[PDB]
Scaffold this motif. Structure first.
Motif, mmCIF file in Angstrom:
data_model
loop_
_atom_site.group_PDB
_atom_site.id
_atom_site.type_symbol
_atom_site.label_atom_id
_atom_site.label_comp_id
_atom_site.label_asym_id
_atom_site.label_seq_id
_atom_site.Cartn_x
_atom_site.Cartn_y
_atom_site.Cartn_z
ATOM 1 N N UNK C 34 -4.041 -7.488 22.028
ATOM 2 C CA UNK C 34 -5.429 -7.115 22.743
ATOM 3 C C UNK C 34 -5.137 -6.481 24.068
ATOM 4 N N UNK C 35 -4.453 -7.360 24.966
ATOM 5 C CA UNK C 35 -4.132 -6.814 26.323
ATOM 6 C C UNK C 35 -3.690 -5.397 26.415
ATOM 7 N N UNK C 36 -2.816 -4.968 25.524
ATOM 8 C CA UNK C 36 -2.193 -3.539 25.156
ATOM 9 C C UNK C 36 -3.256 -2.844 24.335
ATOM 10 N N UNK C 37 -3.865 -3.680 23.405
ATOM 11 C CA UNK C 37 -4.683 -2.793 22.383
ATOM 12 C C UNK C 37 -3.548 -2.537 21.239
ATOM 13 N N UNK C 38 -2.697 -3.028 20.820
ATOM 14 C CA UNK C 38 -1.940 -2.908 19.849
ATOM 15 C C UNK C 38 -1.349 -3.772 18.816
ATOM 16 N N UNK C 39 -1.682 -3.386 17.541
ATOM 17 C CA UNK C 39 -1.247 -3.896 16.558
ATOM 18 C C UNK C 39 0.153 -3.635 15.721
ATOM 19 N N UNK C 40 1.143 -4.681 15.535
ATOM 20 C CA UNK C 40 2.166 -4.572 14.823
ATOM 21 C C UNK C 40 2.206 -5.160 13.400
ATOM 22 N N UNK C 41 1.739 -4.498 12.406
ATOM 23 C CA UNK C 41 1.300 -4.903 11.072
ATOM 24 C C UNK C 41 2.668 -4.357 9.906
ATOM 25 N N UNK C 42 2.929 -5.271 9.014
ATOM 26 C CA UNK C 42 3.701 -4.867 7.751
ATOM 27 C C UNK C 42 3.062 -5.081 6.739
ATOM 28 N N UNK C 43 2.626 -4.293 5.762
ATOM 29 C CA UNK C 43 1.849 -4.573 4.508
ATOM 30 C C UNK C 43 2.983 -4.410 3.305
ATOM 31 N N UNK C 44 3.049 -5.370 2.469
ATOM 32 C CA UNK C 44 3.822 -5.545 1.261
ATOM 33 C C UNK C 44 3.016 -5.409 0.132
ATOM 34 N N UNK C 45 3.057 -4.233 -0.971
ATOM 35 C CA UNK C 45 2.470 -4.536 -2.168
ATOM 36 C C UNK C 45 2.899 -5.610 -3.041
ATOM 37 N N UNK C 46 2.207 -6.531 -3.205
ATOM 38 C CA UNK C 46 2.913 -7.805 -3.893
ATOM 39 C C UNK C 46 2.889 -7.689 -5.463
ATOM 40 N N UNK C 47 2.048 -6.688 -5.966
ATOM 41 C CA UNK C 47 1.735 -6.635 -7.296
ATOM 42 C C UNK C 47 2.642 -5.319 -7.798
ATOM 43 N N UNK C 48 3.811 -4.865 -6.959
ATOM 44 C CA UNK C 48 4.655 -3.759 -7.258
ATOM 45 C C UNK C 48 4.154 -2.623 -6.233
ATOM 46 N N UNK C 49 3.677 -1.477 -7.093
ATOM 47 C CA UNK C 49 3.289 -0.370 -6.249
ATOM 48 C C UNK C 49 1.960 0.042 -6.480
ATOM 49 N N UNK C 50 1.474 0.429 -5.273
ATOM 50 C CA UNK C 50 0.163 0.620 -4.611
ATOM 51 C C UNK C 50 -0.395 1.834 -5.131
ATOM 52 N N UNK C 51 -1.551 1.435 -6.084
ATOM 53 C CA UNK C 51 -2.143 2.461 -6.924
ATOM 54 C C UNK C 51 -2.726 3.704 -6.298
ATOM 55 N N UNK C 52 -2.580 3.432 -4.752
ATOM 56 C CA UNK C 52 -3.376 4.612 -4.087
ATOM 57 C C UNK C 52 -2.510 4.649 -2.756
ATOM 58 N N UNK C 53 -2.706 5.806 -2.059
ATOM 59 C CA UNK C 53 -1.937 6.200 -1.064
ATOM 60 C C UNK C 53 -2.185 5.055 -0.025
ATOM 61 N N UNK C 54 -1.033 4.483 0.681
ATOM 62 C CA UNK C 54 -1.044 3.518 1.724
ATOM 63 C C UNK C 54 -1.918 3.955 3.140
ATOM 64 N N UNK C 55 -1.912 5.225 3.376
ATOM 65 C CA UNK C 55 -2.855 5.609 4.441
ATOM 66 C C UNK C 55 -4.259 5.574 4.102
ATOM 67 N N UNK C 56 -4.762 5.519 2.826
ATOM 68 C CA UNK C 56 -6.235 5.268 2.624
ATOM 69 C C UNK C 56 -6.620 3.742 2.918
ATOM 70 N N UNK C 57 -5.947 3.086 2.864
ATOM 71 C CA UNK C 57 -5.996 1.599 3.046
ATOM 72 C C UNK C 57 -5.576 1.213 4.667
ATOM 73 N N UNK C 58 -5.347 2.071 5.357
ATOM 74 C CA UNK C 58 -5.185 1.453 6.835
ATOM 75 C C UNK C 58 -6.247 1.134 7.561
ATOM 76 N N UNK C 59 -7.672 1.573 7.263
ATOM 77 C CA UNK C 59 -8.685 1.114 8.183
ATOM 78 C C UNK C 59 -9.284 -0.101 7.570
ATOM 79 N N UNK C 60 -8.773 -0.361 6.376
ATOM 80 C CA UNK C 60 -9.211 -1.750 5.409
ATOM 81 C C UNK C 60 -8.458 -2.793 5.960
ATOM 82 N N UNK C 61 -7.070 -2.495 6.226
ATOM 83 C CA UNK C 61 -6.126 -3.511 6.602
ATOM 84 C C UNK C 61 -6.312 -4.020 8.324
#
Lengths: 224, 224, 224, 224
Positions: C34-61
């Motif tokens: 928070x000091x920086x205001x930065x997030x370092x996140x890695x998302x794995x789709x655990x069910x295989x492939x993601x039925x939607x484009x990973x960008x559509x889910x950025x604000x959700x994550x």
């Protein structure tokens, strides 16, 4: 003076009126946020029922809560005159009807800005729109054209309020305003601008006394 | 339907307009308190700058947030039509200049009431008060006379908005409204009354985008 | 609440979703500073492939990792709601396509900050940019317009995510956010500001699973 | 050329510019990791404050750190031109305002990669978004459309940088790039592809100098 109004300032409005011999008193209280140019006031008629329509007393009931843009903060007489305040005098001349003559002291009593008013209405028709309570409980937009009064070291403002009447027609109220400091000294005299003022009158549905809830937005303009 | 509006309800307003070929979009958000009859909405022009004056759009931008007094809650079509909603259509005819033709879906998407609008303006003069942006950033009091339209299971409303112009004139906007439900469920259909609506337009001084902050008070009246 | 965020805080993100019937799940993990205001996140789709484009889910994550400048730390709802957290619920509404509706609980669970999410997308076009995976694996800059939600003791945020398509068109995702705290204490409820958000989507080239590495930089602004 | 970039390569960026008469200089330094296609750069304006918005200069401040997928490495001019380097020259043409003209030599100098730049912007509106610093401190996603320049044994690249203005409008910076190698050596000249670029502008909160931390992720794409 100006920095007295950066936050939300408690208001207290206190009127002692007399319209055609009918003495009445209202006690208003709210808050102002000069930063946004908004007033939130609730007026109770503590003497019973208002002998006049509440609309006719909006302008009588603290233009030091106007939002003056950062450039024309030079033209803001109202806040400059604080915490000592100013004396606002009006002759509200209702067309085809009488008139109110007010004299108010708008000043900081503690951390709260008080508008202590004395109004005297005369010449009013009982059959006319004010005593016959023919005005709608609504309020329209007006421009308060302000000009300096070098002579009195204050300002003068002129404007006609349009009061909507229940048949469809409009009762015009001619305000001839003048403000002068209570202050020992310094006030910023303005160059010709106006306050763009807008108001919305409502009722607290849980309130049995005769009252008015005034929501008002005031913005200084006309100077580029 | 009526009990959806007893608390403070989140609003979302979404317009896609076209005035003289000029495509624009605004996103509004606020809250309504039908209990007090008050709307608090902030509209952003997400496509840049508004090709028309913000005032012309106030009416287009949720009368289900009106305060209907306890003796005419029987006449409240707007809330009765919820959560499915109603379709509000208008032909806002600006005298001597052109006109907006709106069609809006006011409904509950979740816990928030949404007014998704589509507006199309035509026969506007570039030199006229709307495209020449000659209207003041202010709003006056109007009465929205509502009458039932028993056959479409909805209502009709007629009123002329008075838009104050910078030179001292008034640009009249003739609204011919119609509201009809979206749900198959029955709605309450009114006997001739009006919404006394009042508005006050402001600006968030901390906001760089072209916007409008709308404070509006709406009260049903004309039925004793 | 605030001092939980003065170091690097472990994040753990979990989504279960259903877009058009397609259930999936992602596990995100990383760290927020928070000091920086930065997030370092890695998302794995655990069910295989993601039925939607990973960008559509950025604000959700985990907007509680926004960097609030000192002068506006009174405006940080997100961290004030901590450790107990808040519930972020959104309607991501893809223009001309479907909508996600999310509900998430962001809260601390021991040392790490967990964003547990459930998403339900409905009404998507299979030939559209989301199911048809027509979105570039990139991300833009956006301002998250925060407003207070005094009633829900939380915040509403509004923004249009610009999702660039393959053919040089943009897919707007209208986001209508609402956060309410989980705990019962008072929280900091803010004046209109925005979170200046910037993100850059990358891939771990040593990662075989469908994934997304998100680098985000969030900075509160809009109050001088 | 290519195998110089398989690890983390130290970068050193130096700009001297002159925009409307305002000379300045920045020193950038960081590291590039072509394997991931990521740049970690921090720019300090060494002459004090930067006369132009730091975003306007992101494309001016090492595309040889683009990640080329193994199948379009035959298309990577930038790394083939190494160690002797190339000369990137651009015309950044800000729509409705001035233009930068840059000339830079990107080459190795010992173990680090140095982008030495000279920039000259002329014809800027001082009231414009660039001199008036009306640009958000953010950055979007862009595709750098590379084409071969057989005749200058290099490449031309074309793209419009979208610069989000504080009032939510976008300032397009048309970029017309042209790279030619510095050394005698043979270079790889490409089929029409693009560099998918993503960047996120941050601040070192422990840094008092006018600066920019740039996180960039560049990925070559467009050839199947």
């Amino acid at each position: 003076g100006e920095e007295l109004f950066t936050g939300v300032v408690p208001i207290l409005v206190e009127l002692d009126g007399d319209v055609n011999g009918h003495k009445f008193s209202v006690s208003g209280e709210g808050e102002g946020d000069a930063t946004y140019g908004k007033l939130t006031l609730k007026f109770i008629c503590t003497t019973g029922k208002l002998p006049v329509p509440w609309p006719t007393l909006v302008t009588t009931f603290v233009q030091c809560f106007s939002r003056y843009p950062d450039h024309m903060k030079q033209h803001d007489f109202f806040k400059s005159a604080m915490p000592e305040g100013y004396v606002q005098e009006r002759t509200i001349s209702f067309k085809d009807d009488g008139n109110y003559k007010t004299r108010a002291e708008v000043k900081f009593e503690g951390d709260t800005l008080v508008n202590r008013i004395e109004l005297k209405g005369i010449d009013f028709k009982e059959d006319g729109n004010i005593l016959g309570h023919k005005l709608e409980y609504n309020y329209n937009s007006h421009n308060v054209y302000i000009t300096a009064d070098k002579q009195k070291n204050g300002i003068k403002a002129n404007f006609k309020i349009r009061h909507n009447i229940e048949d469809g027609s409009v009762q015009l109220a001619d305000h001839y305003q003048q403000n002068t400091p209570i202050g020992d000294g310094p006030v910023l005299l303005p160059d010709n601008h106006y306050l763009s003022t807008q108001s919305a009158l409502s009722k607290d549905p849980n309130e049995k006394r005769d009252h008015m809830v005034l929501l008002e937005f005031v913005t200084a303009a006309g100077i580029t």
